[PDB]
């Protein structure tokens, strides 16, 4: 038959289901970033858990090792590219020091609220889901869309949105049309 298509899981659940310290930390963290559920917190922790594993293997190698230099610089460059890692912390030791709030800062939902286009973080998600926000000339309706540094300046209302120069929406047309 046809070749199999690869797929993989993008999250992992905690080993201890009930722990007040972790439950309170998650809810405090979900409330700050307007997340739908706990799985969106597990997803960040999962990809951060494997970022640490990759960094540990390179850190055990000698400095100036060809694999450590190539993949370490590439991983740092990618993290700098999405704005998670600062430009003055490209040392692979500050990579281990990264925290989940660094990743939630770079979500589309966080940037819409922090750019003043929305009153609150929960307004940001519905604006995104309702096809109002465009990055560049492309409409993006995924709240977890990770904003790159060069894409940061191009976040604004979609050109065909009621808030961004488009026509009036469904509700207004029904009222003003009577």
């Amino acid at each position: 038959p046809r070749a199999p298509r690869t797929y993989s899981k993008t999250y992992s659940v905690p080993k201890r289901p009930y722990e007040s310290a972790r439950l309170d930390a998650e809810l405090k963290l979900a409330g700050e970033y307007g997340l739908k559920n706990k799985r969106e917190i597990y997803r960040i922790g999962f990809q951060l858990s494997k970022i640490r594993r990759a960094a540990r293997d390179l850190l055990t190698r000698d400095e100036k090792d060809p694999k450590r230099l190539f993949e370490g610089n590439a991983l740092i460059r990618r993290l700098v590219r999405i704005g998670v890692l600062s430009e003055d912390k490209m040392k692979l030791d500050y990579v281990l020091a990264l925290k989940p709030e660094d990743f939630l800062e770079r979500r589309l939902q966080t940037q819409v609220f922090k750019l003043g286009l929305a009153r609150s973080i929960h307004h940001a998600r519905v604006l995104i889901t309702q096809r109002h926000i465009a990055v560049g000339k492309q409409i993006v309706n995924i709240p977890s869309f990770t904003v790159r540094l060069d894409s940061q300046k191009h976040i604004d209302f979609a050109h065909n949105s009621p808030y961004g120069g488009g026509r009036a929406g469904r509700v207004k047309r029904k009222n003003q049309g009577k």
């Binding site: 046809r2 070749a3 230099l69 190539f70």
Partner: protein, 259 residues
């Protein structure tokens, strides 16, 4: 298994074709021909996947049935014909001549050549022996049989085929200092000069090759193809890159500067 296989699973095809996983269940099975199955390139892959002249397998058959495609100066209509190393592909409708030479990345490069260079080819001598009525002959890497060769020509040498009469113009003896491209193994596509030939009776002889950057690698004698009489003097035009293998860090640095 009761007989020869006639299918080729997509996953079981040679990796240097660079076929995608999800385009179908099967891959083009190369026909029997001058080149081995694992070391060939079917014309359907070349005309559709490489040049992208044809959009699908129906179109490559339409191209070849109008007599456009010539391999080694003869019109070929077999869509799965196993073209291989040093073969010449002529498309006089587009006025293009190609030679199948490996690039340094291990794949068959899209190597355009002049019409003057497309008038001959090189073949590695596999064996020299006597035929019926005591007539010596040479077998090249593409299955060619040339009678009455120069009596100095021996195995592992390279001959220059007139490619229109099939005769030998001249040859290169296998010896230290000859220009070489590697045609097998993980050093496939690299170009260098012979430094030292290490003999092993009953086993596999090993050849030490020095890159233009004074990088040394070892490969089996069966993967050695003599292409020039000395360094910097190849008998055919080399593909872009001149067969010098760069490390990934060097490639990343070169790509950064180019862009």
């Amino acid at each position: 298994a009761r007989g020869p296989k006639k299918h080729l699973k997509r996953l079981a095809a040679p990796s240097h074709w660079m076929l995608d996983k999800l385009s179908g269940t099967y891959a083009p099975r190369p026909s029997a021909g001058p080149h081995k199955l694992r070391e060939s390139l079917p014309l359907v892959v070349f005309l559709r996947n490489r040049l992208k002249y044809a959009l699908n397998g129906r179109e490559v058959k339409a191209i070849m049935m109008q007599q456009h495609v010539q391999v080694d100066g003869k019109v070929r209509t077999d869509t799965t014909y196993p073209a291989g190393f040093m073969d010449v592909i002529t498309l006089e409708a587009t006025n293009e001549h190609f030679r199948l030479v490996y690039d340094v990345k291990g794949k068959f490069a899209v190597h355009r050549i002049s019409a003057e260079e497309a008038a001959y080819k090189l073949g590695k001598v596999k064996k020299v022996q006597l035929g019926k009525k005591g007539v010596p002959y040479v077998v090249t890497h593409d299955g060619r049989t040339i009678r009455y060769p120069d009596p100095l020509i021996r195995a592992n040498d390279t001959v220059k085929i007139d490619l229109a009469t099939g005769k030998i113009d001249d040859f290169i003896k296998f010896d230290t200092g000859r220009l070489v491209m590697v045609t097998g193994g993980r050093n496939l596509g690299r170009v260098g000069v012979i430094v030292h030939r290490e003999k092993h009776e009953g086993g596999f002889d090993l050849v030490h090759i020095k890159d233009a950057l004074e990088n040394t690698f070892v490969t089996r004698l069966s993967n050695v193809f003599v292409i020039g009489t000395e360094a910097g003097k190849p008998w055919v035009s080399l593909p872009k890159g001149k067969g010098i293998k760069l490390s990934i860090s060097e490639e990343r640095d070169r790509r950064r500067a180019q862009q």
